[PDB]
């Protein structure tokens, strides 16, 4: 694995990893954090019916 990081990175709010190739992402509209679709178990197909995504942390 590569050492260091890209300063213009976006870290997933669940796994804390950087964005990679051909990955589906979704952003919470309340805290503006980004998440892997795989990490929050949300497919692109499901996200199409989501008007305003609210991450698990903001859903408490």
């Amino acid at each position: 694995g590569p050492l260091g990081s890209d300063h213009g990175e976006t870290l997933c709010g669940a796994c804390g990893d950087s964005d990679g190739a051909d990955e589906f992402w979704i952003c919470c509209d309340l805290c503006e954090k980004w998440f892997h679709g795989k990490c929050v178990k949300i497919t692109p197909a499901r996200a199409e019916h989501i008007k305003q995504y609210k991450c698990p942390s903001c859903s408490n």
Binding site: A21, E23, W25, I26, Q52
Partner: peptide, 9 residues
């Protein structure tokens, strides 16, 4: 929802 799909290599 605010989503995004990243490109391939």
């Amino acid at each position: 929802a605010r989503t995004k799909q990243t490109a391939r290599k």
